[PDB]
Design a protein around this ligand. Structure first.
Ligand code: CDL
Ligand code: CDL
Ligand code: CDL
Ligand code: CDL
Ligand code: CDL
Ligand code: UQ8
Lengths: 49, 53, 135, 105, 17, 70, 32, 365, 161, 95, 67, 28
């Protein structure tokens, strides 16, 4: 159930909030999305990711 | 039911309100407070169903 | 009179033909009781009401009769152990489903894994130091 | 073939079950789906779609299965001045004027 | 109100009540 | 059901006759022993390891299709 | 059966939506 | 006529609580053999107000079950007894089901009638397939403002003496004291004149009810005692979004506390989306509330009512196997395994459908 | 009835167990085959609440088992002190302190509230779609009123002459 | 003292789970860092842990599914549960 | 009674904060949420109702306002 | 006013002319 399981609620809405930022017109989100994941492990050290 | 939630949220499921107010204070009152042992003007409730005498 | 009329009527109080073959709950509920639930007192009323129907509310028959445990719970700890060995992730998944409906933040989940694997890493270093003392 | 009584309903609707004490504590989470087969059931997506081309296309398909239906299909696709097969009646002009031309005799 | 439902409430080994 | 289970059934055909036909329908200790070791298709015979591979294979393969389709 | 037609025609002229339960109640109200 | 059949009787004041007979209206279903539903109206409310609801072709409830619009004791046409114990009132329904040759029935209720319906499932669960409660909950409502107003109206209705007061005196007294428009109309329709124009009186026993409400103790109809126990069967609850009787904040918890099989909100407990209106309690008057209640009622009767506890819906009848507890069957040479629970015919006790289908089964073999 | 076609095209690389294209639906089926179906219990009390004394024994048995095995447990405790203080003082605000201090950070709550409303819409899916069809059935019945008028034209013409 | 009534909307434990978890583990580490001979205490506790649990298993839990039920304590709950109802209906019975 | 107010103040402690005196700062319940209670979804609906009544069901006002 | 009451129960908007036709139907 995607509406009762908070694990998929968090991951679904979080992924949707990131991909909608393609409207900010940085570049092809299909390109830098992989860089976001690597960058998330530089600054994510602050949050123990 | 027998599945009411986690142990930390156990005292949450006890309150039942007679009004539509939000948020609801969770604490469910156990007893009536009796701070001063005052002699009641009320007559005793033992004098209830004693026959004529 | 109508009340006693239906108590005597065989059609009103009669098991079905297949009732003997059906699985029967052989307990009134006093073997395993829910102690900390908010409806705890309502559970006891149903146990008392079940015991009264069995003896037509003449509980002296229950006092003289034999008392039995809940035999349906026999060997239940063994059976859950073998089901855990059979499919540990499927057993753990469904036993924790309702609890996992409330998911903590990414930080809390990361702290759980970080502190758990850190404790296991120190445990391995303590094992390796014991081989140093044996040498 | 047997049909039973039209006045009665299927026996599944008439069978019932009652509870008693003690009662199983377990609450069902999902409906069991051991085998992935849902044959002979139409999709629930076909719910509130408006009228469109699929309606007159499937109408001809079922009409052409009958003798009278084959006459209707051939006449409409040949002898009806309409710019669309999605026929919508919003006026009785063509209906009334077709009656006055016939009721004179 | 509420009444005791056990009919054997006042039964003792020596008799009733 | 898999061919390895069918191969067991061909070999255990005489054993299946001793337990299911003879011992199973008796009473007493011999009956309880036969009904307990009855031979047939497996209850809860699913292999979770085989099922674990099929799931992780399908999930990891959908990732390969995204990462390679650039 | 004949009294059903009498009430239904009356409700027909007033273009009022009618149900068999209403007619049965009105017919029962007439005999009652 | 045919669909609407209300048996006519006279209320009898009974000294014994067991010699109490219930009267009401019976609504015949569209089809030959259907399970029956017993529905209780709100306290001091007419059974006839629910007839257009249960006989609406759009809702088509009678296509599922026969409906008994039954009055409780001291209400309407049934016998009068000073006690309002939910256990004694529940045994009344069982004698009614016996006299009417009903093996088991669905129970419904509105408001306080919802408490009565759920109480019958608590005391006789083996005779009840399910409970559908409308704008009610098994909770102490003695301090809800909506109940206090009803309790206050009944108290003021004791002032009227039908012998001395004229008809114009009664009409003025009701308009001035009873400010709620619906309670006013209901109480006027309860006033009836006896034979030989003896006098006027309320259809419900005003003396017995007032003492129950005015005493405001455990036996009050607003209270739900722990003595009632737990309902073990199927239960569905529906109430308005802004209801003065059931507050969504906390008044749902009693449903989990009393009903063992209630899953929670969105599965067995729904709220009708509506505005704040003190008359929204009477869902049958407003089409918006009535349409949602009827659809949820049809869904309950069709797929969830009278289904085993561990089955999801009626669709699983015959294809879902329930685990068995060991050493639970009398047969010693029994191989324990999963089984599908037996569902019985709705009036199997008073018909011979099992004997007739046994002989038809032998003709096949 | 015309003889229909024998068969349509059969794709040589698409099967039901090995579907060619990918989606979360097939992964969902393989997932629930792995964890198995819902483990329905037939009992009247849960397994944990019926074995609290026995589970307490094995729980403490494995605690003692680890404690008897770990000779250097004090070294692990002291080596864990700094990370315990560090990660809790660093992440206190983002986990709990935000609920009564400078900023709420209600991002996670907004996603719960959106899901709670979607859960409610799915609960009333039957009512909402049935109200939508009633308007389409109203339009459809309004178009069918013309065929009912023409069928009676023959009766009108018969009585008119 | 009087009943410590909480005026809040949520209970104190659930609102401070992260904080109480810190102080919960602080005192565990505090005891763990202080107890240098903790392994000697774990081994010294093994024998009584095995002995008392195997000896009292039947009287606590085993009786619920084995030879005898021993329902003495249940009879005390059932009588008290009925008295709770009689006190709740005191006004009715006396009236 | 005569000595009630003096004794009740002497026996127990009261709250000295006036946190709820400020109107707009009052919480709707989204700060400390119960996650596992069986009426969990009824709690979220009451929070949503509180947020909708504050903005007359124009939640854009809540998005622009301070939390 | 029995005719008015049954109509009120069904929530049917009734005019005064309809009530008279129904009363005349019963009395006549
Ligand atoms: C002179 C020459 C001859 C000399 C002979 C000497 C020997 C004497 C023979 C006579 C002795 C028996 C007398 C008749 C007994 C009749 C009693 C009875 O009616 O049955 C009760 C009992 C009822 O059980 P039940 O009702 O079916 O279910 C139990 C409950 O439902 C509960 O089930 P549960 O699911 O909830 O699980 C809880 C359960 C079990 O759960 C547990 O937690 C215990 C776990 C123990 C196993 C694990 C130990 C840990 C180490 C291994 C780790 C395993 C890990 C596996 C997984 C791998 C890693 C993940 O708890 C129990 O303790 C149940 C045990 C039975 C109750 C008895 C009272 C026990 C209380 C004290 C407990 C402490 C001792 C436990 C001993 C082991 C218990 C199995 O049945 C029996 O136990 C039968 C036992 C007697 C069998 C006799 C066999 C023939 C004897 C001769 C064989 C030759 C012996 C040669 C010896 C040589 C010398 C060394
Ligand atoms: C053979 C090996 C033997 C040795 C190992 C033995 C291991 C045995 C333990 C097994 C695991 C623990 C059992 C957990 C029970 C089931 C899960 C559960 O808790 O139900 C959920 C339930 C409520 O959670 P929920 O309903 O899901 O609501 C949360 C929402 O989802 C949304 O969340 P929210 O926004 O509402 O709040 C945020 C979040 C709050 O943020 C947190 O979750 C706080 C925890 C973050 C991570 C902490 C570090 C990770 C700990 C494990 C790694 C080991 C560390 C190394 C230890 C070295 C020293 C030995 O809340 C939570 O998510 C749950 C927090 C409740 C506390 C969790 C349980 C205690 C911590 C874990 C115990 C650690 C024992 C393992 C080592 C034992 C060695 C003898 O929690 C409760 O049961 C309520 C009980 C009261 C909890 C609050 C007060 C705690 C006071 C005691 C603290 C003990 C600390 C021990 C520290 C260890 C020493 C340094
Ligand atoms: C145009 C825009 C640019 C495009 C953007 C496109 C972005 C794409 C979005 C796609 C999302 C990812 C999709 C897949 C993941 C979904 C499943 C999931 O796991 O999500 C977490 C998911 C959702 O988390 P949540 O609890 O709901 O919180 C949601 C949000 O975090 C909100 O939580 P909140 O409401 O509480 O917010 C408060 C916030 C408060 O934070 C703040 O206020 C400021 C934070 C400042 C950070 C300071 C950094 C300091 C660095 C110091 C480092 C010094 C040492 C360096 C040494 C280097 C060598 C010298 O604190 C946090 O929550 C932090 C969360 C952790 C952040 C870690 C990454 C931080 C940097 C990310 C950079 C990305 C580019 C951003 C560009 C835009 C910039 C404007 O958590 C789960 O429960 C699912 C399972 C998690 C298991 C844990 C272990 C999983 C490990 C693998 C994860 C997956 C692989 C890695 C992917 C990336 C993950 C980090
Ligand atoms: C050679 C000699 C040695 C060998 C001898 C043989 C000994 C073998 C030992 C095995 C014993 C028999 C096995 C039977 C099953 C396991 C025992 C059990 O309790 O399961 C029943 C219990 C549910 O039974 P139930 O009553 O029928 O469920 C009804 C409801 O559906 C349940 O959910 P609900 O919310 O609807 O209802 C309330 C629920 C509330 O309780 C909960 O729901 C728990 C909430 C936690 C879930 C939150 C998410 C966290 C978990 C996520 C997944 C993590 C794992 C996967 C990720 C990593 C992948 C590797 O249940 C409760 O009322 C309380 C539950 C029991 C008390 C708390 C349990 C703490 C210890 C058990 C967990 C151990 C964690 C690891 C520590 C060990 C170090 C490795 O299962 C669980 O709660 C999860 C445990 C699953 C098994 C994993 C552990 C197996 C070994 C446990 C042995 C005893 C504990 C030893 C350590 C103690 C440390 C303090
Ligand atoms: C220099 C630096 C060092 C100095 C730093 C200074 C700072 C120190 C930090 C201290 C923090 C003080 C402020 C908070 C005090 C109370 C903490 C608390 O949880 O209260 C909330 C909790 C419920 O509050 P609520 O949310 O408003 O709910 C109200 C309803 O009544 C609730 O009732 P309900 O049944 O309806 O709902 C569930 C209920 C369920 O909880 C209960 O009703 C009872 C729980 C068991 C109570 C403890 C049984 C212990 C039996 C005695 C044997 C050990 C005695 C220890 C001393 C022996 C000699 C060494 O409670 C809960 O809501 C979830 C459980 C939350 C955890 C509470 C239990 C944790 C163990 C606390 C005992 C600590 C001593 C033993 C620990 C091991 C030895 C070190 O109250 C209690 O549990 C009272 C227990 C006794 C309180 C005093 C205990 C000593 C201080 C406790 C510190 C806890 C963390 C450190 C130890 C943890 C080790 C694992
Ligand atoms: C190619 O693209 C890719 C995928 O496809 C999309 C992936 O799925 C994946 C993901 C990978 C996976 C999901 C697989 C994960 C598997 C992992 C992690 C390890 C698997 C380990 C096991 C299953 C344990 C197996 C245990 C053993 C082999 C030991 C016991 C077996 C023994 C002793 C048998 C002796 C072996 C032989 C005689 C070899 C002969 C081979 C045979 C098949 C004979 C079998 C004989 C009989 C009688 C059955 C990747 C990485 C990938 O790159």
């Amino acid at each position: 159930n995607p509406n009762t399981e908070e694990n998929t609620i968090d991951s679904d809405y979080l992924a949707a909030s990131g991909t909608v930022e393609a409207e900010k017109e940085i570049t092809s989100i299909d390109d830098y999305l992989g860089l976001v994941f690597a960058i998330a492990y530089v600054f994510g050290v602050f949050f123990y990711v | 039911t027998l599945q009411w939630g986690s142990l930390a949220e156990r005292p949450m499921v006890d309150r039942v309100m007679s009004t539509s107010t939000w948020p609801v204070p969770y604490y469910q009152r156990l007893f009536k407070a009796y701070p001063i042992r005052e002699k009641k003007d009320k007559m005793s409730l033992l004098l209830s169903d004693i026959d004529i005498d | 009179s109508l009340h006693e009329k239906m108590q005597t009527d065989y059609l009103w109080v009669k098991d079905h033909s297949q009732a003997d073959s059906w699985a029967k709950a052989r307990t009134h509920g006093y073997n395993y009781i829910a102690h900390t639930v908010p409806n705890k007192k309502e559970r006891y009323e149903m146990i008392w009401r079940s015991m009264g129907k069995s003896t037509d509310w003449e509980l002296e028959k229950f006092r003289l009769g034999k008392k039995f445990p809940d035999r349906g719970n026999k060997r239940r700890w063994f059976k859950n152990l073998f089901r855990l060995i059979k499919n540990p992730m499927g057993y753990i998944f469904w036993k924790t489903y309702k609890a996992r409906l409330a998911k903590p933040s990414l930080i809390v989940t990361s702290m759980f894994i970080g502190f758990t694997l850190g404790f296991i890493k120190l445990k391995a270093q303590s094992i390796a130091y014991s081989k140093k003392q044996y040498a | 073939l047997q049909w039973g009584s039209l006045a009665e309903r299927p026996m599944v609707d008439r069978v019932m079950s009652t509870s008693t004490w003690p009662v199983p504590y377990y609450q069902r989470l999902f409906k069991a789906y051991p085998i992935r087969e849902k044959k002979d059931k139409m999709s629930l997506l076909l719910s509130d779609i408006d009228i469109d081309d699929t309606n007159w296309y499937q109408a001809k398909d079922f009409l052409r299965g009958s003798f009278r239906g084959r006459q209707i299909v051939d006449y409409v696709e040949n002898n009806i001045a309409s710019n669309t097969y999605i026929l919508i009646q919003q006026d009785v002009a063509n209906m009334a004027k077709a009656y006055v031309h016939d009721i004179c005799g | 109100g509420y009444k005791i439902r056990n009919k054997s409430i006042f039964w003792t080994r020596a008799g009733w009540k | 059901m898999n061919p390895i289970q069918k191969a067991w059934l061909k070999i255990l055909e005489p054993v299946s006759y001793v337990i299911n036909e003879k011992m199973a329908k008796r009473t007493g200790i011999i009956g309880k022993l036969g009904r307990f070791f009855a031979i047939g298709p497996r209850e809860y015979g699913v292999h979770p390891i085989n099922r674990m591979f099929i799931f992780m294979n399908r999930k990891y393969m959908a990732f390969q299709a995204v990462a390679l389709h650039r | 059966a004949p009294q059903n037609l009498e009430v239904e025609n009356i409700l027909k002229r007033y273009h009022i939506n009618y149900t068999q339960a209403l007619i049965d109640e009105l017919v029962d109200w007439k005999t009652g | 006529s045919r669909i609407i059949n209300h048996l006519r009787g006279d209320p009898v004041y009974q000294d014994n609580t067991k010699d109490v007979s219930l009267r009401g209206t019976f609504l015949r279903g569209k089809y030959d053999d259907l399970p029956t539903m017993i529905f209780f109206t709100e306290a001091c409310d007419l059974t006839a107000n629910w007839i257009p609801f249960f006989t609406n072709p759009q809702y088509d409830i009678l296509a599922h079950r026969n409906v008994w619009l039954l009055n409780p004791r001291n209400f309407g046409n049934s016998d009068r007894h000073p006690s309002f114990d939910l256990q004694e009132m529940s045994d009344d329904v069982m004698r009614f089901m016996y006299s009417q040759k009903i093996s088991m029935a669905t129970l419904g209720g509105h408001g306080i009638g919802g408490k009565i319906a759920l109480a019958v499932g608590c005391y006789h669960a083996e005779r009840v397939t399910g409970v559908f409660s409308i704008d009610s909950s098994p909770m102490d409502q003695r301090y809800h403002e909506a109940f206090k107003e009803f309790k206050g109206y009944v108290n003021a209705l004791t002032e009227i003496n039908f012998k001395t007061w004229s008809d114009k005196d009664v009409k003025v007294f009701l308009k001035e004291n009873i400010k709620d428009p619906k309670w006013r109309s209901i109480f006027t329709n309860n006033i009836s004149k006896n034979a030989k124009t003896q006098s006027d009186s309320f259809n419900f026993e005003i003396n017995y009810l007032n003492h129950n409400l005015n005493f405001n103790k455990a036996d009050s109809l607003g209270n739900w005692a722990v003595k009632n126990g737990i309902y073990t069967g199927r239960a569905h609850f529906i109430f308005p979004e802004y209801s003065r009787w059931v507050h969504l904040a906390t008044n749902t918890l009693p449903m989990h506390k009393v009903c063992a099989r209630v899953k929670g909100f969105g599965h067995d407990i729904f709220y009708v989306q509506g505005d704040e209106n003190p008359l929204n309690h009477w869902v049958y008057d407003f089409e918006n509330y009535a349409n949602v209640v009827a659809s949820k009622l049809n869904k309950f009767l069709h797929s969830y009512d009278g289904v085993h506890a561990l089955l999801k819906d009626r669709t699983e009848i015959g294809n879902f196997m329930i685990p068995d507890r060991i050493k639970s069957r009398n047969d010693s040479k029994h191989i324990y395994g999963d089984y599908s629970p037996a569902h019985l015919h709705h009036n199997w006790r008073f018909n011979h459908i099992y004997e007739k289908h046994d002989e038809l089964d032998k003709k096949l073999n | 009835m015309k003889k229909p076609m024998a068969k349509a095209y059969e794709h040589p690389y698409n099967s039901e167990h090995h579907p060619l294209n990918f989606s979360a639906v097939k992964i969902a089926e393989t997932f629930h085959d792995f964890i198995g179906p819902e483990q329905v219990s037939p009992h009247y009390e849960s397994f944990a609440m019926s074995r609290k004394f026995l589970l307490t024994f094995w729980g403490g048995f494995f605690v003692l088992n680890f404690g008897m095995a770990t000779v250097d447990l004090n070294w692990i405790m002291k080596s864990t002190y700094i990370p315990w203080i560090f990660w809790f003082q660093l992440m206190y605000f983002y986990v709990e302190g935000k609920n009564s201090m400078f900023m709420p950070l209600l991002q996670r709550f907004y996603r719960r509230a959106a899901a709670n409303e979607i859960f409610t819409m799915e609960a009333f899916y039957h009512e909402n779609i049935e109200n939508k069809l009633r308007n389409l059935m109203r339009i459809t019945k309004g178009q069918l009123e013309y065929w009912d008028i023409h069928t009676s034209y023959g009766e009108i013409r018969a009585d008119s002459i």
